[PDB]
Design a protein around this ligand. Structure first.
Ligand SMILES: CCCCCCCCCCCCCCCCCC(=O)OC[C@H](COP(=O)([O-])OCC(O)COP(=O)([O-])OC[C@@H](COC(=O)CCCCCCCCCCCCCCCCC)OC(=O)CCCCCCCCCCCCCCCCC)OC(=O)CCCCCCCCCCCCCCCCC
Ligand SMILES: CCCCCCCCCCCCCCCCCC(=O)OC[C@H](COP(=O)([O-])OCC(O)COP(=O)([O-])OC[C@@H](COC(=O)CCCCCCCCCCCCCCCCC)OC(=O)CCCCCCCCCCCCCCCCC)OC(=O)CCCCCCCCCCCCCCCCC
Ligand SMILES: CCCCCCCCCCCCCCCCCC(=O)OC[C@H](COP(=O)([O-])OCC(O)COP(=O)([O-])OC[C@@H](COC(=O)CCCCCCCCCCCCCCCCC)OC(=O)CCCCCCCCCCCCCCCCC)OC(=O)CCCCCCCCCCCCCCCCC
Ligand SMILES: CCCCCCCCCCCCCCCCCC(=O)OC[C@H](COP(=O)([O-])OCC(O)COP(=O)([O-])OC[C@@H](COC(=O)CCCCCCCCCCCCCCCCC)OC(=O)CCCCCCCCCCCCCCCCC)OC(=O)CCCCCCCCCCCCCCCCC
Ligand SMILES: CCCCCCCCCCCCCCCCCC(=O)OC[C@H](COP(=O)([O-])OCC[N+](C)(C)C)OC(=O)CCCCCCCCCCCCCCCCC
Ligand SMILES: CCCCCCCCCCCCCCCCCC(=O)OC[C@H](COP(=O)([O-])OCC[N+](C)(C)C)OC(=O)CCCCCCCCCCCCCCCCC
Ligand SMILES: COC1=C(OC)C(=O)C(C/C=C(/C)CC/C=C(\C)CC/C=C(\C)CC/C=C(\C)CC/C=C(\C)CC/C=C(\C)CC/C=C(/C)CCC=C(C)C)=C(C)C1=O
Ligand SMILES: CCCCCCCCCCCCCCCCCC(=O)OC[C@H](COP(=O)(O)OCCN)OC(=O)CCCCCCCCCCCCCCCCC
Lengths: 193, 247, 251, 126, 173, 153, 98, 122
């Protein structure tokens, strides 16, 4: 949509500012990226989602799909984190109140096998950690495939050496060219015919 | 293109209060054999409250329809820099006018059965007991008014049975095909596979972006080609402006 | 279970199978409808003798199984070795199998006379078709050239029912109107095959120089089975049987 | 042996069916709908096929009571199931995001909202 | 496996499955001038089959809705006596069953031909659904990718140099 | 597509041959087949012949379907009418007419019959449509409507 | 260079049949292996027979069980492929006839 | 000018705010359309505070009601504030509905004015 002369090539500008030895530099040189196919490889790649989104945001800032992905991911992090905290707070409040009355849920061994920690302590620990792990697991699966496709497109662009801004990029007001609203219709003339 | 199709998802919710009343009425009729007047006033009162709720909804829609024909608008006189109120007549498709009359008849019928019920509840209170004749008559009134509530759903009938009318005679030799029954049995096979695949095979996810505004207003570009409606150039301009404002 | 019910109760199961099975298989193989029929007939005739012999042998065993018991008088080995008797019965079946094969597959040369052609007194029709196919069959040992492939694609709409009206557009055909018309007539109107053009043949020789150097002949024309197989025998100038035909071949 | 399977009919397809004993061998100790209807059918079938007038008439009196009892049992079934259906229906639409993004072309009549014919509608007079 | 696999209105288990609601939505964002005469014929045939199919869907859902309505009333089958409550309650149960059936996608040879054609008409329809019907295309693209269909319009394209215009749902690489 | 060569107008001898050809086609027309003289007469007659071929196969399958589905589905389905779901044997349950059913198993046999016969026909027609091939008279692109003149044949 | 183009309609129909056939074959094989194991277990536990006879019967029982599961997809692909092959053969013969 | 269908996304709060501001202060809109949006704002703002005020009065009465008064404070306050919550949300819900419905009507008028609907013409 952006004409070649109206493109600011912000991605190229960021690429130039990158260090000499960088992964993006290698992709530009011709390095090809393949998503992991083994379970162990996928598990490792699960923790690289944040790094990929950040660099893509830097490379293609103002890109519609990338900007939308950041907004949705940030909102999901906030929504999931607060839900996890609320569940932990409610569960902790419930456990304490019933424990005060002498009622303890018969979950987990009463005493620890090694350090002898009491059941109540581990119930609090499990309540605090388990929802956090589920939140991380839930978020990663939702955005793992989406992030990989965005990373795959970025690598393909580098391999082809296409450092110009992609389609659906909307620059701020400063970088937007003003529109000429002065139009002078040509003088009317009777047709010779 | 003026098919006038109303969403069934919107229609069913509107239809809940009426079907609720007839079911309650039947239970009152069935339970009247072994129940007393005092105990059953809970059902009678519930029906009356529901009937009042439907009466308000009928009137509010009835009031809206009749108010259509008075076209009132504000006109800005630039010389005096004053807004003035003006009244004018209405011009619209006659199908809208015809259904309005049908909806007017529906309202008067509902006002009739409401007064019928109001008459019924008052008399049983004075008598001190309910009777099958009047109680059953009111229940059947609820059923009849419920049937008449589907008056404005006629476009779906035309949408279905108008396509049967346009089918020409077989031996005029326009297409030389009749697939009525063949489609009937084939669709049984297709629906059987469709349902089994839906609940046992891959189902595409429904996740979507919920936060980025105007994300799905996709302006034309190389990816989507340029075969859109011709006058969407303005739409692309507006979409471009909105994204700039967001960023 | 719905499919299993379909398999058992399919009406095609009750319907008798026809002779079109060979034709359909041959058409799927690649043979034309006419070519498939000719190849199907040759295969059926070759196998009919074997099938006929098996039925004849089985019928002979069924009616005259007591001969083996009777022969025990002269050959007690049958009486005291049932395995020997079974082999004798198997040999008898094979004996009828070979006799049927001989009648329907052996050359059994006979005169080309309309008065007895096709009576099966001589296996002339099968022999002539078999000889013609083997003699004249040579696989195309080339690769279709670009010109031939282009011509095949251009032959999508050709039809002999009505000749196409060729129109010369200088901006898309080039050359001159006279030259273009002459080339078009050669390509389509004349019916000349793509491989018969002089420049096409030259390209074939140049591309297959390695085969020519090795001493292998290049077959310009692909083998046309319908041009050598004719169950009716008209192609081989075999006189049709008089009583089943109302016409004569010069010979 | 095709006739042995087509033209030979099972004994049950001709002779009158007996009583399913397993349906009565073990029964719950609750005078619920299931027992009431089983008793109703037993008397009802007996009345149809029995020639004894003394036992039929008393069965009719007992059967009339069973009809009233079964009506009471059904009334509870009608109430609970009907209320559950209505509550589920109300809850479904409360937590269901109703699509409010359908096309609105039908409500718009550009040629009628702004009369295209203008003054030509009134008389003409050209 | 019926004996009419040639029939255009017929379908296979693995053919592209499209719902009636999806089919009618797609018709809104298409122009006839931009389709080849062959493309128009495919749509006209599709309407011919859909004309009968849509009307039959309530017929298929009738026995299911009829049974559900009986269960709601109770465990008593009273014949003509219960028609009022049966058909009064069935007037809302049957639309629910049709709602499920209409939302259910069904395979059809025409659906795969129209969407998956590798010609100008196939490209045109896919792009129009992609742009003007992003909600439908997202589900459609996921189905196409799962069935080993590769087109530039698919959001799951791994050899594209331009970012997808819609969220890409999880799937196996 | 491309256009074929347009022949020059026919001479009188060609006109006579066309007239003779049309006369032969008219004579060959069956007397019991009522088709109007029109450009689409031959096309319609060919369509009718293909429809008749489909009609034959359909009814043979339908008759076969009745023969097969009976012992397989309908007769076993009639075993469900031996007893009610409560376990008591089948007894008449009148709707509005208290018909007298003194004959042995009159209530059960007739009650089952009302459901078996519709099922018997329903399954057979499904059997007919399932196993009957319409390929002969199916034209997806409607290319068989081209007019065929009597002299062309 | 240009080359013969198959009918898109036939290609799409084959794709559906092939996808179904591949899925059935993988599932059918496991059914066959399970069927063989179950038959072997039953034969060695309730049937008085030699091991070779039991093994042969189990192998046929498994193969028969696998065939029943996969018959629909195999039959569906076979007829679609046969029709496609005939259409392709006829088209190519019409183009190359001389 | 937006996607239609069940699978589409319903209007977001941000989208509604942007559109209503666009209708109010954009030059490409006509005076009558702008007046419609302006009238919607003024005529709808009443319900927002009217519902809240009505809820407070009812809640104050309900706090002293025959049973609520004698309940403990934990139950009394929670039960007594329900009428306020029901009326407060009713007033806000009706305000947004009234404003949005007329704003959406103005949006429809704007689309027809500039011919941005693919199936609408004179
Ligand atoms: C990525 C990191 C994320 C971290 C998240 C935070 C939470 C976890 C870490 C928290 C640490 C700090 C906690 C506070 C400490 C306070 C001190 C204290 O008193 O302790 C509190 C309390 C223990 O006190 P206690 O009084 O002794 O109570 C003991 C009761 O028996 C205990 O009973 P219980 O009531 O707790 O119940 C048993 C326990 C369940 O625990 C089990 O026993 C289940 C064991 C499952 C084994 C699965 C197979 C593993 C195969 C090999 C894996 C190799 C590593 C692969 C790495 C992949 C890449 C990540 O819980 C449950 O059953 C319910 C939870 C459901 C399961 C979810 C578990 C998720 C764990 C995620 C983190 C994993 C980290 C692994 C690190 C590397 C390990 C090599 O601490 C805990 O409960 C924490 C447990 C954490 C997991 C321990 C795993 C031990 C088994 C290891 C096997 C492999 C190596 C064996 C080596 C042998 C020697 C040669
Ligand atoms: C929270 C977790 C999430 C859960 C989610 C699910 C549930 C959510 C529910 C949300 C609502 C909760 C509200 C709580 C309020 C608590 C207020 C308070 O201070 O309570 C302390 C007090 C604490 O109890 P406690 O001292 O520890 O225990 C000993 C009792 O005090 C010992 O005293 P008692 O046993 O004598 O009880 C006093 C008796 C005192 O009442 C009586 O003497 C009996 C009066 C006749 C009742 C007949 C019931 C059967 C027929 C239906 C009602 C007939 C009227 C018609 C209304 C509907 C149709 C228009 O009143 C009741 O307790 C029950 C009254 C009847 C049901 C409530 C409806 C009132 C209807 C009758 C009033 C007249 C209305 C006129 C027309 C209205 C038109 C809009 O709580 C109560 O006992 C009050 C209970 C109130 C009912 C709340 C439960 C609602 C959900 C289940 C029942 C559904 C029935 C629906 C009927 C309508 C269908 C259309
Ligand atoms: C109830 C107690 C139980 C006992 C009774 C059984 C149950 C009740 C139904 C029985 C009566 C059915 C009607 C008579 C059909 C048989 C007539 C006959 O033998 O004369 C030869 C006559 C011509 O046969 P053909 O030329 O040899 O055709 C076979 C060839 O294969 C070619 O086949 P094709 O697939 O190409 O179709 C051929 C047919 C195809 O025709 C069509 O295309 C028409 C169908 C179009 C589709 C349906 C549109 C209307 C419904 C729309 C529903 C909308 C719902 C609402 C949606 C929105 C709101 C929710 O077209 C023609 O050949 C031209 C003539 C068309 C006439 C159609 C009208 C027939 C009825 C009026 C005359 C007879 C009086 C009946 C009195 C009332 C009966 C209830 O037979 C036909 O009508 C065609 C065959 C029909 C199937 C076999 C029927 C076997 C009989 C038992 C059927 C059991 C019921 C299950 C099937 C459903 C009914 C079909
Ligand atoms: C399965 C397919 C079915 C298809 C569909 C069929 C549908 C039904 C249609 C049926 C229509 C009827 C067809 C009948 C065909 C018959 C054959 C035929 O057409 O041959 C024409 C035959 C043509 O033979 P050709 O000139 O040698 O030409 C060679 C052949 O074209 C060809 O020669 P080649 O190259 O094949 O062989 C060369 C040479 C190579 O072979 C030889 O040289 C063989 C030499 C030995 C003879 C064959 C073995 C005999 C074994 C001993 C006897 C049987 C033993 C077992 C039983 C015990 C017997 C006691 O063979 C010959 O010399 C042939 C001579 C002809 C006789 C031998 C033919 C075999 C006879 C088998 C008889 C059993 C089968 C049933 C009856 C016949 C069929 C209906 O024409 C004539 O000879 C007729 C000329 C007549 C001229 C005018 C005569 C005027 C009258 C003067 C005399 C008046 C006497 C008055 C007496 C009164 C006294 C008081
Ligand atoms: C602007 C809005 C509308 C304005 C118009 C006002 C409309 C007012 C309508 C009032 C309706 C009142 C109906 C009362 C029916 C009483 C029936 C009766 O006598 O009971 C018999 C009996 C009463 O039985 P019972 O149960 O009371 O006791 C029988 C005796 N025991 C119990 C001892 C055995 O009911 C029956 O037999 C049952 C069937 C009743 C059918 C009633 C039909 C009424 C038809 C009314 C037509 C009105 C036309 C209006 C035209 C327009 C006017 C503007
Ligand atoms: C160790 C403890 C033992 C306890 C005893 C009980 C043990 C029970 C063991 C059950 C094993 C089940 C194995 C199922 C294998 C399926 C194989 C397969 O794919 O076949 C598909 C076929 C159908 O194939 P299809 O082609 O229709 O479709 C298959 C599915 N799709 C379409 C997805 C490919 O089904 C069969 O025909 C299976 C049965 C074969 C015949 C053997 C049947 C034995 C049981 C008969 C009982 C009859 C009782 C009376 C019924 C009266 C009815 C009125
Ligand atoms: C895609 O798949 C397909 C289709 O689309 C879905 C098709 O349409 C078709 C079209 C072709 C068809 C033939 C249609 C096929 C339709 C099918 C299979 C569904 C319909 C099936 C039926 C109607 C059969 C229903 C019958 C039954 C299940 C039998 C019920 C039997 C019962 C209950 C037996 C009860 C008996 C007893 C308990 C015995 C009691 C005995 C006593 C003595 C009484 C007790 C007495 C004492 C004393 C104790 C095909 C082939 C197909 O494959
Ligand atoms: C393959 C290597 C492994 C070893 C096998 C070698 C096979 C060699 C080739 C086949 C050998 C066939 C002969 C076998 C041994 C002898 C069989 C026999 O007994 O046949 C004679 C028998 C006579 O009938 P009989 O029972 O004596 O009745 C007397 C009534 N008073 O009549 C019969 O029973 C008929 C015998 C027919 C033999 C075959 C003939 C060819 C055509 C067969 C058509 C299909 C027959 C299907 C039979 C199904 C039976 C269930």
């Amino acid at each position: 949509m952006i004409l070649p002369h109206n493109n600011r090539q912000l991605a190229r500008q960021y690429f130039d500012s990158l260090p000499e030895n960088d992964i993006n530099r290698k992709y530009y040189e011709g390095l090809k990226y393949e998503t992991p196919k083994t379970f162990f490889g996928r598990f490792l790649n699960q923790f690289n989602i944040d790094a990929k989104l950040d660099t893509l945001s830097k490379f293609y800032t103002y890109q519609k799909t990338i900007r939308a992905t950041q907004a949705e991911l940030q909102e999901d992090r906030k929504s999931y984190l607060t839900n996890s905290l609320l569940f932990t707070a409610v569960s902790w409040f419930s456990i304490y109140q019933f424990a005060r009355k002498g009622a303890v849920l018969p979950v987990l061994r009463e005493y620890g096998r090694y350090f002898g920690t009491h059941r109540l302590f581990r119930q609090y620990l499990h309540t605090l950690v388990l929802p956090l792990l589920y939140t991380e697991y839930a978020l990663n699966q939702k955005y793992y495939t989406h992030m990989e496709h965005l990373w795959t497109v970025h690598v393909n662009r580098l391999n082809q050496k296409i450092l110009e801004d992609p389609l659906y990029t909307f620059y701020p007001q400063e970088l937007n060219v003003p529109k000429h609203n002065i139009i002078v219709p040509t003088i009317f003339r009777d047709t010779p015919q | 293109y003026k098919t006038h199709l109303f969403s069934w998802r919107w229609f069913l919710i509107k239809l809940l209060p009426s079907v609720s009343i007839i079911l309650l009425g039947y239970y009152l009729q069935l339970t009247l054999k072994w129940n007393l007047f005092n105990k059953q006033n809970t059902i009678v009162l519930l029906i009356t409250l529901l009937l009042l709720y439907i009466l308000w909804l009928e009137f509010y829609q009835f009031y809206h329809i009749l108010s259509f024909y008075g076209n009132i608008n504000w006109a800005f006189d630039y010389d005096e820099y004053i807004w003035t109120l003006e009244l004018d007549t209405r011009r619209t498709r006659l199908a809208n006018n015809y259904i309005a009359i049908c909806l007017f008849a529906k309202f008067w019928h509902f006002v009739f059965i409401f007064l019928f019920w109001v008459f019924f509840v008052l008399r049983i209170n004075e008598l001190g007991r309910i009777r099958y004749p009047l109680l059953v008559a009111n229940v059947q009134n609820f059923i009849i008014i419920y049937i008449m509530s589907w008056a404005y759903m006629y476009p779906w009938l035309k949408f279905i049975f108008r396509k049967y009318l346009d089918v020409p005679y077989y031996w005029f030799y326009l297409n030389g095909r009749e697939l009525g029954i063949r489609v009937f049995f084939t669709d049984l096979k297709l629906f059987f596979y469709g349902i089994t695949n839906r609940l046992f095979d891959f189902n595409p996810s429904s996740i979507k972006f919920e936060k980025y505004p105007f994300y799905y207003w996709i302006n034309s570009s190389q990816l989507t080609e340029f075969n859109q409606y011709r006058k969407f150039v303005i739409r692309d301009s507006i979409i471009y402006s909105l994204n700039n404002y967001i960023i | 279970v719905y499919h299993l019910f379909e398999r058992i109760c399919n009406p095609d199961n009750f319907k008798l199978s026809g002779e079109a099975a060979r034709v359909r298989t041959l058409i799927a193989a690649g043979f034309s409808k006419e070519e498939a029929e000719q190849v199907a007939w040759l295969q059926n005739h070759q196998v009919n003798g074997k099938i006929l012999g098996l039925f004849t042998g089985g019928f002979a065993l069924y009616c005259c199984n007591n001969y083996f018991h009777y022969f025990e008088r002269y050959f007690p080995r049958l009486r005291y070795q049932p395995f020997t008797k079974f082999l004798a019965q198997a040999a008898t079946v094979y004996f009828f199998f070979k006799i049927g094969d001989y009648y329907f597959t052996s050359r059994r040369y006979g005169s080309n006379d309309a008065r007895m052609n096709g009576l099966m007194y001589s296996n002339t029709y099968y022999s002539t078709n078999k000889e013609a196919l083997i003699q004249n069959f040579e696989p195309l040992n080339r690769k279709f050239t670009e010109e031939e492939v282009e011509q095949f694609l251009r032959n999508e709409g050709r039809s002999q029912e009505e000749k196409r009206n060729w129109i010369y557009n200088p901006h898309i055909h080039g050359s001159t109107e006279g030259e273009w018309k002459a080339d078009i007539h050669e390509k389509f109107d004349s019916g000349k095959a793509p491989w018969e053009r002089e420049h096409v043949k030259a390209k074939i020789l140049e591309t297959n120089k390695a085969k020519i150097d090795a001493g292998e002949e290049i077959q310009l024309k692909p083998f046309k089975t319908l041009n050598h197989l004719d169950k009716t025998g008209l192609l081989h100038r075999l006189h049709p049987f008089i009583w089943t035909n109302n016409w004569t071949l010069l010979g | 042996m095709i006739w042995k399977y087509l033209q030979r009919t099972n004994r049950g397809n001709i002779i009158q069916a007996g009583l399913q004993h397993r349906k009565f061998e073990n029964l719950p100790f609750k005078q619920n709908f299931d027992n009431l209807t089983k008793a109703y059918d037993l008397r009802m079938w007996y009345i149809s096929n029995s020639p004894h007038e003394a036992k039929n008439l008393e069965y009719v009196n007992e059967l009339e009571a069973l009809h009233n009892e079964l009506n009471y049992q059904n009334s509870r079934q009608f109430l609970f199931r009907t209320v559950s259906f209505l509550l589920g229906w109300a809850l479904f639409y409360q937590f269901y995001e109703l699509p409010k993004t359908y096309d609105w072309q039908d409500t718009q009549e550009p040629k009628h909202q702004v009369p295209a014919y203008g003054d030509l509608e009134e008389g003409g007079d050209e | 496996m019926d004996n009419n696999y040639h029939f255009w209105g017929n379908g296979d288990r693995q053919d592209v499955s499209l719902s009636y609601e999806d089919y009618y939505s797609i018709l809104d964002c298409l122009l006839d001038e931009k389709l080849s005469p062959q493309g128009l014929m495919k749509f006209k045939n599709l309407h011919e089959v859909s004309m009968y199919g849509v009307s039959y869907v309530p017929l298929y859902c009738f026995p299911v809705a009829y049974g559900i309505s009986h269960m709601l009333t109770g465990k008593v089958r009273r014949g003509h006596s219960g028609y009022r409550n049966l058909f009064s309650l069935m007037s809302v149960v049957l639309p629910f069953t049709c709602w499920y059936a209409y939302t259910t996608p069904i395979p059809r040879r025409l659906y795969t031909e129209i969407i998956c054609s590798n010609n100008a008409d196939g490209a045109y329809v896919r792009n129009r659904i992609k742009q003007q019907k992003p909600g439908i295309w997202r589900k459609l693209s996921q189905q196409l990718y799962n069935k080993n269909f590769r087109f530039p319009e698919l959001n799951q394209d791994l050899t594209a140099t331009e970012f997808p215009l819609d969220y890409v749902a999880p799937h196996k690489f | 597509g491309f256009e074929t060569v347009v022949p020059a107008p026919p001479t009188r001898d060609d006109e006579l041959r066309m007239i003779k050809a049309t006369e032969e086609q008219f004579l060959q027309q069956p007397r019991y087949k009522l088709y109007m003289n029109e450009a689409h007469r031959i096309a319609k007659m060919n369509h009718g012949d293909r429809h008749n071929n489909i009609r034959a196969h359909f009814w043979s399958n339908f008759a076969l379907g009745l023969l097969i589905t009976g012992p397989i589905f309908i007769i076993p389905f009639g075993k469900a009418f031996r007893n009610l779901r409560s376990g008591v044997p089948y007894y008449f349950r009148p709707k509005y007419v208290f018909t007298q059913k003194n004959q042995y198993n009159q209530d059960r046999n007739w009650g089952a019959m009302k459901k078996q016969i519709p099922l018997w026909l329903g399954l057979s027609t499904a059997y007919a449509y399932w196993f009957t091939d319409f390929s002969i008279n199916d034209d997806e692109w409607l290319e068989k409507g081209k007019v065929i003149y009597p002299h062309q044949t | 260079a240009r080359d013969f183009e198959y009918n898109n309609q036939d290609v799409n129909q084959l794709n559906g049949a092939f996808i179904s056939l591949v899925e059935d074959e993988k599932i059918g094989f496991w059914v066959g292996v399970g069927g063989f194991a179950y038959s072997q277990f039953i034969m060695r536990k309730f049937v008085k027979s030699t091991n070779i006879f039991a093994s042969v019967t189990s192998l046929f029982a498994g193969a028969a069980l696998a065939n029943l599961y996969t018959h629909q997809s195999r039959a569906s692909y076979a007829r679609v492929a046969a029709r496609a092959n005939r259409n392709a053969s006829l088209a190519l013969n019409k183009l190359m006839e001389y | 000018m937006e996607p239609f269908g069940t699978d589409e996304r319903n209007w977001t709060h941000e989208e509604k705010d942007i559109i209503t501001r666009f209708l109010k202060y954009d030059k490409h809109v006509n005076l009558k359309t702008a007046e419609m949006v302006y009238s919607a704002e003024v005529e709808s703002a009443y319900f927002g505070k009217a519902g809240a005020l009505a809820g407070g009065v009812i809640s104050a009465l309900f706090f002293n009601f025959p049973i609520v008064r004698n309940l403990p404070i934990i139950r009394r306050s929670v039960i007594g504030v329900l009428p306020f919550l029901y009326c407060y949300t009713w007033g806000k819900n009706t305000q947004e509905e009234l404003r949005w419905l007329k704003t959406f009507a103005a949006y429809q008028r704007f689309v027809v004015y500039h011919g941005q609907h693919c199936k609408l013409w004179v």
